[PDB]
Amino acid sequence: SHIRGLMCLEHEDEKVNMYCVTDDQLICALCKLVGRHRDHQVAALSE
Ligand SMILES: [Zn+2]
Ligand SMILES: [Zn+2]
């Protein structure tokens, strides 16, 4: 059983990675690699 999670919207076989503070919208690694969220701002490790 595994019908829970906060993966990407377009990427079903890819779980999120962090939160883009610039655009203010959660994203994944595939977005930071395929998309344009590579030079954007994020937050690693919940303070
Ligand atoms: Zn994605
Ligand atoms: Zn972004």
Curated annotation (Swiss-Prot):
Zinc finger regions, B box-type:
5-45
Q: In which tissues is it expressed?
A: In the fetus, highest expression found in kidney, followed by brain and lung. Expressed at low levels in fetal liver. In the adult, most abundant in heart, placenta and brain.
Amino acids binding Zn(2+) 3: C8, H11, C31, H37
Highest taxon of the source?
Answer: Eukaryota
Q: What induces it?
A: A retroviral element acts as an alternative tissue-specific promoter for this gene. The LTR of an HERV-E element enhances the expression in placenta and embryonic kidney.
* Function summary: Has E3 ubiquitin ligase activity towards IGBP1, promoting its monoubiquitination, which results in deprotection of the catalytic subunit of protein phosphatase PP2A, and its subsequent degradation by polyubiquitination.
As for family, the record states:
Belongs to the TRIM/RBCC family.
- What name does the UniProt record give this protein? E3 ubiquitin-protein ligase Midline-1
This chain's source organism reads: Homo sapiens
Instruction: Report which part of the complete sequence is shown.
Output: 168 to 214 of 667
